[PDB]
Design a protein around this nucleic acid. Sequence first.
DNA 1: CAAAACAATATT
DNA 2: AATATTGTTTTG
Length: 111
Amino acid sequence: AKAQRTHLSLEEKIKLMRLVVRHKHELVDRKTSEFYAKIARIGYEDEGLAIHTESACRNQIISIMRVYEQRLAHRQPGMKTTPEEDELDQLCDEWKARLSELQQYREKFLV
DNA sequence: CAAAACAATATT
DNA sequence: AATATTGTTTTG
């Protein structure tokens, strides 16, 4: 997680996503934020990332997606395989699936 | 030099 | 209100 000041991000990104996926099942209709509001809570009370806010919990995770989709279409030569990058990719895929599953439900309700 | 990721902002 | 985005900072 880049941030204003940090030593290693790639590590933080994985740690953050490692929590979202582990809590992808958790979800409340009453309050959507109730989710991201919990991730930033356990992400700073266990991972010790630093400081995050509900809103920030929606921008950070969101940003990681844009990159995941961008580097997903690239699939171009000139890059080497890595364990860290591989894990992050897997975590993103799992999280992406959960988001899609929830979206499908919406379509069922309407049309 | 360039891309990635955050944190806040712009747009719907 | 919710999301991708936009500006700035960090990583590569």
